[model samples]
Target: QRCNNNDKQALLQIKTALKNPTITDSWVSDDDCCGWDLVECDETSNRIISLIIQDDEALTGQIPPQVGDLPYLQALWFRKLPNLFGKIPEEISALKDLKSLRLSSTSLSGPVPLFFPQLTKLTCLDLSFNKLLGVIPPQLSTLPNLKALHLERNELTGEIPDIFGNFAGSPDIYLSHNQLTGFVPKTFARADPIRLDFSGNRLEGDISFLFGPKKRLEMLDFSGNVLSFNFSRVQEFPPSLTYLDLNHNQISGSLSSELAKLDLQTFNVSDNNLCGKIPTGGNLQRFDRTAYLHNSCLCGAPLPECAAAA
Candidate 1:
């Protein structure tokens, strides 16, 4: 029933500062360091509360600031380590019972930490596929128990932080493949997050006010940006959407048969500059014809029929 004694001396100084001696060979020292290997304890004050380390191809250095000296971590995971790299330690803001801090597919780099709003019991802040850079810190929208804000595959650039539309839990916001540019941040109308992947970056105007009709979005991906609006002025979409991707953008109007009335599992407004006609029911024929391809004059029954519109 062990694991205390300076928490196994900060787990042997986080096992040689995480120099991965084959990823901590069960962190030996006569056992019971909470039965070692990626430690986990506290079955009645045995301390060391859940320290995780994952997928190493021979784990290397950095990120070990003695993990803020294991003050009962809640869940600290170092995921898919690609020879783990640096700069996540301001002694990790001294993990005050931290909650789910994932270092995703590491190769970690800088910026995103301005002391991370002092981690007041963070919900889940995954630094996605690292190589991090600037422009995501307005003290990271002052995390008030963030739900899920993963800063997607990095190389970050500007715009999209107008008080980050002020999140108030409803967070499932991933900023996918960065290099982000202007627009889409008029404080996001009223910040109702629920699975927003501003896909592949280079954002542009009139994101149709991010669609609505009592919104609580499900999975809205703004694919391949340069998004030009006017999709019949987007009648509405938020009966808990299923997965609407605005493929290839530069979008034009006409297709809103109220988008065939809900229940979608995946829908793409293909290659854009749409015109419309499809919507002969059963939810727009449940996506075929590449979900309405290379549009400019989209027709019926999957596509190609508006020819009779004399």
Candidate 2:
């Protein structure tokens, strides 16, 4: 398979725009762009489908819009390029055929581009560990095919959008370690999400909706936030939950006995304002005493025995 002439020109433009001539040394004026390093092409049409440029490579400057000219482009990975800065080009949204897009661990800044849903074929979109700032875009909920979305460890702020209520697929949404504030949306329960990480933010409010029926959640972490809730009403978590963390919050009230029925691999509610006797049966007794530390008046096998109520 050979590269189309137009696709060849698109590669050349990307190389020139990168300003790192050495990084694109193999991207010569060759007739077959399919032979270029970091480029993958379709077996029959020879059209470029994947462009992966990762590692510690120091490519800097805006991602060239010309790269969007590759009509068949599907996956683009630009990971750990520490020096790549500037807004993600809106033109890249023209790659309607794109499926997976990763631009993690870079120096990129600016709001997450608003044209994401336009890439209707997108499945995985990871822009983590960047300096990106802005609210989690609501348009993202409209991406019918998106599965995994990672935007952690950034300076992003503002309330999380509740648009994921009925996502077309089971998506793993990660927006942790940001400056995000506001309550987790109740609508999220309707999405049947695979995993949701809103930890390490400023989020507040009850999260009971997450444990309700119709959820398929596996991991839920709201740690390091200001979230407060009483566990007595949370009789059962999403049946699939294996990891749960609500540590370091303003959460009060004792753990409900119902929590002992679950088979959690990891559970933590330490450093909260919770009080009363920790449940003793099932998985509750398996966790170390450290997980019950720093809470208000909690006691059981893991902690000291509860004194008589009098």
Candidate 3:
């Protein structure tokens, strides 16, 4: 099938805008764009539908805005190109039918464009391992079909917005290893079961809300932060959690027996201000002393047996 004229032009503009012409040497003027490198087209309409360029070859310079002119474009992936620096072109937001967008492991900097939530049909948005900065726009929760949002290993800052409660689909949200500060939204208690990572940040506050009766959180990692909370709240840890890491935090107070009620396979509350006997029985008995190391006055089987006094 013949490629659309607009798609051909779009590909030409992208090829010309790039730093090294040899990287896209196959994008000749006379050839159909559907036959070009990293281009895909629909079998029926011959309109370009996908553009993936992850070759080791470095693609520098601004992404050509003309590439957004493809009316039928649905997926765009430009992964692992360390040389792809600069802000995402706002024109790309015009891809109304786009379902998947991944531009990870790059040198892209600047604020994440606010136009992202406008891509209502998006199912996955991954922009991890970049130099992007600024607050995560709360409007992202508006994407009804979104199932995965990965923004880890960036330089993002500011408090996480409470919009996750608005998402109808249970989305796996990863925002770890950033400089983000502020509280985890209490509204997160309403979210569906999923993996949520906010570790290696500066976020602080009581996290008991995350284990609300309505939530079904499976994996939670808030390690390497300043989060402080009393462990007195019984049964606060969700039952569905399989991985729990709250190490290297400012959490103070005594260990609660309710912690042993969790079905965790990997648990760590080490390096905190915790005291008293470590909870025993259930899955807690299987954990070694390393999981309770470096605490204030923690004792019991994992450490030393606590005195039978007050």
Candidate 4:
């Protein structure tokens, strides 16, 4: 009673997949038809709007293209399903108001599909935790009102697009835990309210390249990277920063006593090659040993007393 026969077709596909030779027929009847895994409907009208299936590590089949026919469809989240090989139907471009999309931790293998740029109305998009590869489209920044973007835990390559920061508005950006390379985009001269994260990448550059004259930025995470910059300049971070995670990186410099001058909420520089006492006083003094632990050469309180590594 909701979308044009699309729901019926998707139901047929799910039913067929359940009847595969590798599985047992448990819910073959129509008693709990829509109650099957990954199926969801609107709360008010009981009209189908979402389909989510995950952890079916043995699932193998092509996703039904007809599923895109659902009118109010907002999301299609899947994860950890095995043998799930197939190309995403280009018809999904028709869902003009899709707000969030997620597909991760699956057995999918192929060139990731690009969604319609008009879906730029989306607020959250996640294609992480998958086997997707290729360049992230620069057109995604064209999304006029997007908010949060997640593309972590994938095999994506290529430089970070500067157009991303030039979008209509700054959005919470997360691109950590990937194989991304190149310098962080400097297009934030026009960025809106933001929280940027590019940790766990192969990017290399000085920290100064990120500190902009614009001070409205909050939350800066460049941990687990190969950053080279003066640790002393950290005092210049804007007062709006709430979290600063630089742990597990290749930062090789002494802790600047001047760092205690700022009012950071969280600070971490563990696992780097540095020797110096952590600054005292200010909000930084409240941090625990976990904040500055694991460096083979760091000497400071909270860390176990030991001779510095040569």
Best by TM-score: 2
Deviation in Å, model 4, residue 182 alpha carbon: 1.3
> What is the overall TM-score of model 4 with all chains considered together?
0.78
Write candidate 3's Cα lDDT for 1-310 as tens digits.
4988888887877777775457577887777788888778989989999988785545676566776887688899878888788888898888998898998888888999999888889998999998999989888888889888999999999888877667777788899999998888877777774888889999898887777445678898989999988866635666687898989998888866767777889899999988887777778768999988999888888688887674
Q: Which is the better candidate, 1 or 2, if ranked by lDDT?
A: 2
Cα RMSD, model 3 = 2.6
Off by over 4 Å in 3: 20-37, 55-57, 234-236, 307-310
Model 4, range 212-246, lDDT digits (tens) per residue?
44566678888988876556554455556667788
Ranking of models by lDDT: 2, 3, 1, 4
* Full-model lDDT for every candidate: 0.82, 0.84, 0.83, 0.68
Local error of candidate 4 at 222, Å?
A: 1.9
If both were scored by TM-score, which would come out higher, candidate 2 or candidate 4?
2
TM-score of each prediction? 0.35, 0.93, 0.89, 0.78
Superposed by TM-score, candidate 1 places the C-alpha of residue 79 at a distance from the truth, in angstroms, of: 13
What digit string (tens of lDDT, one per residue) describes model 1 on residues 1-310?
Answer: 4667888888788787776467688888888788877878877888888888888778787777888888778889888888788768788888877878998888889887788778778889898988888888866687787889898998889988788878777678898889989888877768778789988898887777766888788889888888887878778777878888888888887877776778888888888888858767646776888977998888877776778546
**lDDT tens digits, residue span 1-310, model 2:** 3678888888888887887557577887744678878899998877899998787565767667887798898999888888788888887877889999998999889999899988999999999999999788887888888889999999999998877566788689888999999888888766778788889999998888788645788899889999978866687666777899998998988787767767789899989999899987778889999878999888888898998673
What is the alpha-carbon lDDT of model 1 when measured against the actual structure?
A: 0.82
